[PDB]
Design a protein around this nucleic acid. Structure first.
Ligand code: PLR
Ligand code: PLR
Lengths: 466, 466, 456, 456
RNA sequence: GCCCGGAUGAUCCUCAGUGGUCUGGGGUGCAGGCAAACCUGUAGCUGUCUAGCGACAGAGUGGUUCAAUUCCACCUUUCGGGCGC
RNA sequence: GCCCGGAUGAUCCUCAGUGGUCUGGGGUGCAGGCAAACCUGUAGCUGUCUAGCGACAGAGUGGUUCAAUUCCACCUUUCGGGCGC
């Protein structure tokens, strides 16, 4: 095996083309335009992992947190990143620390590409959006120690509602105003509540962009002006709004004319990675760092690793293509539901200000007698349609002591029951066509039961009977 | 490929021996005594993953959280568990939900095996110990709304200290009492502070078991009696105490004679998995469930998956063997440091009540002139010794506004500077021998510089010069 | 935990849809039309591997071949298939020690037979994967024929300049009889009269077989299999076809099918890697006489690697027959695009595309305007394309001499002693993308510019 | 990000310790004494694979063998080594299209040569891995000898009842001359006078080689290689040694070394899976004449699979020479334990351990007290052990007849026509654990109890 | 290896009985009463903590019941019966 | 493919100049003044939002500087020079 020096030359020159892509990533911190090949990616990950002390060849550990791993399956599935992330001259996990920095720089680049070009700082946190919102509220407590209220335009979603209560504050629920079919921000009620309670007693205004139709993204510009005038922090729930240029442009415009202290988005919903992580972003770099420093102890590196792999494999061109296809799939889904609803004397709710979610009416379904609105949601489930959300009339729900009327509808008395469908990133035409086909069959069976492909149906009938 | 019915028979009978181990796990929820083979484990994981809707063959998704995965590397490294964990007749992630239940049952079994036999309930949370302690304090706020103080016997560790402040409470630092070389709980000062502030103003007493020598685990029994008498919650930081039968028995005895509302432990420190997760356990089942319900939104399944793989691969016998070896390695490390310290006129601090961590004095090192105590920590680092913690005299440190004197030493004026080493799970004899060998060389070079194996040293001298 | 009857039910319902696909594969042995999801595939492979005795839970081994694996990396990368395929006396016999590997082998051979029919040879009777490449697989065919024709010494072989298929005859222990090709236009084609003359000179009983070739580099074209098959049928001489990468060509496959219809074809051999985009190491031996194909299989001594069979099994189940058909359709489309791009580029440099309509895979462009005795440009062009990361382009100079196993070829790489000119080869093989052609055209354009500049 | 000069420095310092191990391997080609960590190994493999042209970033392919991979599962499980080993005319020649695979092949063969010396044949001159099992590898040896001895028709072969090594001679196209063994005590040993008599009867020029066997089932023992090597040297006859699983036996290896010292051994062949705990599919051909071993390698037509070479490379780098030595030492210890346990069990059932001290791997226990014409207990015992998940135990009955490739064996599996009794085989092969023997003893004890109960 | 029928686990040993705090038939050791005999009393193991003495707990895992050595399911061991490339 | 030397990116087109808000030498279109001519003025692209008009932003990515078309590093493109299983 005595190798020729040309072999060592060829072996060195072969690695240079890969190192060049790695050096460009490290120098400018931007997503590659075209995605890396898997070989470049895994070479990069292996070279980062060996920088952590637990992967040193001559390492000995006499501490209680040495990154020892009992299972080889566990070590390999994490690419030997064991020490997690957190934060100088004696780094125990220099590779994980570099992984954290690059990942945050890549996500910041995507956030600018997605529409918030003036974002100043962001970081990945391995908690989902709800806990990440809680961490924002926990940071604001020390800044506004006399504050106990969070003003919150109503959106029926348990995680973002619980985030305020888990943080130890009292939500002030601002009901929405019905304009046509849409539920929109009641700016008059928001400002009246600010004056009633007093700006010093308000921890922040907690607004939401991405949401289920017929709710639309909040009027962020007007809310940001209210927050700037009364010196009240503004925290935006942007859980799955990164994928929507409409939502991102609302955030940029809100920060331009007024105040947005932070906006939070889910990793899984915007980057097609496992549930578990989120991004906290903002326009004041010092404040965003303050939220980061509020986190006690080290944290999992697994969500950062997931989105690092994803963005390097997709590239900015790959992510742009997903954003374009999401818009095209939204138009296709909208046209298909419009065509289907006509056959059953239903209609697509008129919600032009919601760019992600759509709703079809269910007025022809008798829920009081036949409970067909509830039956529809079950039948769609047994036919393996996921994400189709059915909203009946008059649902009463208690969440952490607060009682919601008309729950899931974001208002006390919406005119009708309806069904939700959304065009989120990664959806294919097959998703739309199968959903339309199965929804058609479910509506037929509901109507047929009042007058008096195959294997999904055979198991559906058995589950429906059980 | 027309197969014989005997082939289908053989193929069915072959899987039965594996399914038998799986059924026993699901029926009784106990760790297997002997570890599963990898084939049984991966068959089990694959059968769980296909129960999640994102892995259904005929699934169509029209929602915003469908578990879509852009990168095949990401999907495979998580065994196709994408939906995370959280919490009925329409489960979107029935496989992940079963994974969560089994993992919590396995961890509960290990906690009983480790020494807390009367534990009633526990759950894995994908946050490290600091954030998990915060979640405990956040849960207690609603129970004791007039409380603002957390009484806390001092331990110099930034994560557990920050946990109280991030939760929005004011730590009341109780200084420790020096008994011989050991720093122990000042029970008189704890109770005097309870009476001074008033029990209703105390959110909880926050005690600690696992800690660096010369601090020892807190007097949990006496603290639990104080908590029971004054009706004050008791939260125990047991970050890496699961591996110590001494620590676990303190927790069981504390709950027997008094009150322990919850104890928290790190996943990585006690189970040799990546940093990122923790276990919250307790003796009141309803209260432990209350902490669980306080968490907003879904959470990462990756820490649960790691410890599930680990415990199924190790078995209870494998974990018991690691616990036994940790005790043997503690005696060996203690005897080796005792022998080395004699050669340099130092000594092993007398800390018999700390079963994990040890400390060797550094009295012969001149830190005021030569800064040799600080130099020692650097030299050990450059020689690739990790976890060796050097504690100089007179370190002043501010953490979230609070100023610590004598930081890292858990007291304002400890008699001497010292060096920490620990026998944690997974440590091998090689770790001890290499640490002893390199510490010997570092002490020689420090003393030699006052009078006036090879490649680790060559790089160490270069880093030491830089 | 508390596995309610719901979890037991849901776990069975979830496995049903995957097992439906598996059962359809086992009952009919056909390639799935649409490819399987990875989850179905890895579930299938895991359930196959657990059938092998080395993966049994309560197993104890007291033998010398227990399938023990020292490295976990080795075991996992092979999906725990350790025992190989076959038994000591037959690579097709079922191994009770390795029932899962035996099932893997049977399914794989059935999928491959299905593809061969889909690819164009609908009358194929039997085939099997062998974990040797095409040259060594041709040798196995010749080794099988020896006992049937004990007086045979020669193999009649229309010339094709490829060392492996030439050495296959010599390694088998026979003497190649090289039949020179006929220049018909720009194409090199079978000299049928010279083939029949050698049959009459040497004697049919002295000839082990006629060894013809379909897939080849332009300007050579597939052999005239129909006329060769008639010669073989008339003289009772076996006919072995080297079809190394002809599975991807419906024209090559139809030519094999037609030769078997009008005359005699005893076996045809094809490469796994060239036709199924898997690593090098395996081949397929196929034929129309079921018993004779089984004879070749039984000639193989001992067990053999399962790795090539596992690769094609994974590939075909993931692609599906629709996926493979799509790759075949795209190969034709890329052939037309590559040909048009070469024609366009050849105009700009006063060259031309050689007219080889009977070769559906390989193309040839003249290099007559390049001087090699003056500049050595023809020889340099090959290494210039290589340094610019163009792979697969053959530069064929004039008058190259090459000795292979004692036999001297004149005009090597050109399949004849004096082809009129030097030329460049490019091919449209399965898996090729439009970017492959565009980069090749751009980089070849830069190579020719540099040679002209270096002369001027 | 902000890769400070610290991160660039730390990244280079971290890679240094791993590259030190790699450079030590490349400069000397020796097995590391202590095994590599997985991180070092996978870093090495990844840097090798990126040297292959199919893994280049700016590559375009216009050929028919570009190493395209349709399935990502296939590409990853092979660490992106797609091109196989060798070239069209030589499996040892460097492939400029696959420089990484060529380097993998050279390193692997060097590691294997190092182990062969460590295992006991210190005078070995050359060896190479071939991705065929032992039987097919023996065939390649015989195929190489044909051109050197064109009049040769026969292979003289001391009988061993194993179908692969017997078929290897026939597949190569030669006639086996079966030499019956001599009963010496309980052992079956080489009949040297019958071997020399066949040499004189048939004529040395008519004999292709003498084909001897080391590793074998008791009561057969390794052949008398020293006396056979002298016979071959005196008559100028090649000597090919079947050493299928003898690498793990220092006594087998020393016997090969001594035969080469006093006489002639042209090549010895061993299985990869039986000696290195890797999947079935590869073998090692080794010898003492460097040029002749290279001749066998050059006889192989075409490229070949890299998968067996990758498996042994991973295994040997992970084990280290210390790891392999430890497995060899444990095999001897397990042999003594298995033998003592069999002796103890054989006492309880009025049986005995056959005295076969010259076989260091395989053991044989009598089954004379079992009646087969009355109860068919001997035949049933085999399937009884199988149903209790005992693998590798050979039950050898009396008077079994078996036809292999037209040749009829009498007393098959027993290596002689009339061995005095039926017996049971068990072996201590590398990787065996104490649990293997204890489970075997317990389950065999239960089988014998059931047979006696069924009779009574 | 699996299916099926039993027994089996951890209160000195055994053998019976018993849903009610266990029982009594033989023994063994220790200890006393009056050398077999014989009467009366007594009894072991594991983990953790502790310098110790001792202290906290365990009776295969769970279930039912006010109450389980007793009844139920599973597991461990073992005895049966059956299946035998 | 790589190393090296330049130029190059996104204000009508070009060609020069310029660290100072750009310049002027030729042209083109549009628009007026007095058919070549000729004078004066004017100018494009992308993303997002919007029924629209329009509105918010972008000049390759960053750096230096009070200030960058100008200077620096890298990237894109391209022209050179060199390297050729
Ligand atoms: C293993 C073995 C062989 C070779 O068998 P293959 O399946 O070809 O590898 C030959 N002879 C003996 C004695 C063997 O044990
Ligand atoms: C591929 C090929 C062969 C076989 O080459 P191997 O390396 O043995 O697979 C034979 N003839 C031709 C024309 C080929 O293209």
């Amino acid at each position: 095996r005595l190798v020729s020096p040309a072999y060592v030359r060829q072996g060195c020159e072969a690695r240079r083309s890969h190192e060049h892509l790695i050096r460009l990533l490290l120098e400018k911190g931007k997503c590659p335009e075209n995605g890396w090949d898997e070989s470049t990616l895994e070479l990069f990950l292996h070279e980062l992992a060996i920088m952590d002390s637990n992967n040193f060849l001559g390492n000995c550990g006499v501490g209680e947190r040495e990154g020892r791993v009992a299972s080889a399956l566990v070590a390999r599935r994490h690419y030997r990143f064991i020490h997690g992330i957190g934060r100088a001259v004696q780094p125990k996990a220099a590779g994980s620390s570099l992984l954290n920095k690059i990942t945050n720089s890549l996500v910041l680049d995507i956030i600018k590409l997605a529409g918030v070009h003036t974002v100043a700082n962001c970081f990945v946190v391995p908690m989902a959006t709800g806990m990440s919102l809680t961490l924002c509220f926990l940071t604001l407590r020390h800044k506004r120690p006399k504050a106990k209220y969070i003003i919150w335009p109503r959106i029926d979603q348990k995680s973002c509602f619980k985030s305020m209560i888990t943080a130890g504050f009292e939500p002030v629920v601002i009901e929405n105003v019905l304009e046509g079919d849409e539920l929109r921000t009641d700016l008059k009620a928001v400002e009246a509540k600010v004056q009633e309670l007093g700006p010093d007693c308000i921890l922040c205004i907690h607004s939401t962009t991405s949401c289920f139709a017929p709710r639309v993204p909040d009027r962020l510009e007007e809310l940001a002006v209210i927050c700037a005038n009364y010196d009240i922090p503004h925290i935006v729930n942007n859980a799955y709004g990164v994928q929507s240029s409409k939502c991102m442009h609302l955030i940029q415009q809100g920060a331009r004319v007024g105040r947005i202290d932070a906006f939070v988005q889910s990793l899984d919903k915007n980057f097609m990675v496992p549930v578990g992580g989120a991004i906290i972003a903002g326009f004041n770099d010092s404040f965003i760092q303050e939220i980061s420093k509020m986190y006690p102890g080290r944290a999992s590196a697994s969500p950062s690793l997931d989105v690092l792999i994803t963005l390097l494999s997709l590239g900015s061109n790959g992510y742009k293509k997903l954003l374009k296809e999401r818009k095209e799939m939204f138009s296709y889904l909208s046209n298909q539901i419009k065509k289907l609803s006509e056959a059953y004397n239903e209609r697509l709710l008129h919600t032009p200000h919601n760019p992600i979610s759509l709703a079809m009416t269910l007025k022809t379904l008798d829920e009081h007698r036949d409970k067909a609105v509830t039956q529809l949601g079950s039948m769609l489930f047994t036919r393996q349609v996921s994400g189709a959300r059915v909203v009946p009339l008059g649902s009463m729900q208690t969440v952490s002591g607060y009682t919601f009327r008309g729950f899931m509808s974001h208002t006390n008395n919406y005119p009708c029951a309806y069904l939700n469908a959304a065009s989120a990133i990664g959806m294919k035409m097959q998703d739309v066509d199968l959903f339309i086909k199965r929804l058609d069959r479910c509506l037929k069976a509901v109507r047929k039961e009042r007058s008096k492909d195959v294997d999904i149906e055979e198991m559906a009938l058995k589950l429906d009977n059980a």
